[PDB]
């Protein structure tokens, strides 16, 4: 992997363990949470290389994602390639951009605008891009490039990347996750 960055945003709301040199991490939020966490492992600068992962992920009670997650500095954007998830589909509610096919499934693609919300520069206004896998799974390869190229026709800057990680996020309910990046 060449993992050089640990993502920890409110990981203390649950039990986050990781080992950078093995590329593994776990997160348990068995009791539930009612605030947002995002944890995981990755690289201080994102790129379009494929990511292969393997996970156990149990969050059917939970507003949660298992996703490639990362940011672009300018135009400021937060992005997700959601491989599996719980009770909430961000594309149910956001503006639809269409569909992309990659790595064995279609993904619905959507975007949203967040105003004065926490971001890599503090509090600011940014765009979100989502690809949500139609056949959810917890192991495989994500050909990031196919998503970036599709989003780029819709304004995604597709360069000037900040961090990028394989992540678990939850903001409600309980669940459990253990992930290896290969």
From Swiss-Prot:
The keyword Transferase does not apply. It catalyses: Endohydrolysis of (1->4)-beta-D-xylosidic linkages in xylans. Keywords: Carbohydrate metabolism, Disulfide bond, Glycosidase, Hydrolase, Polysaccharide degradation, Secreted, Signal, Xylan degradation. It is found in: Secreted. Residues 1-182 form the GH11 domain. Belongs to the glycosyl hydrolase 11 (cellulase G) family. Its EC number is 3.2.1.8. Gene3D superfamilies: 2.60.120.180. It comes from the Eukaryota. The active site is at 78 (nucleophile), 169 (proton donor). GO terms for biological process: xylan catabolic process. This is Endo-1,4-beta-xylanase 3. PROSITE patterns: GH11_1, GH11_2, GH11_3. GO terms for cellular component: extracellular region. The keyword Membrane does not apply. Pfam families: Glyco_hydro_11. It comes from Aspergillus kawachii (strain NBRC 4308). Disulfide bonds join 91-110. Pathway: Glycan degradation; xylan degradation. GO terms for molecular function: endo-1,4-beta-xylanase activity.
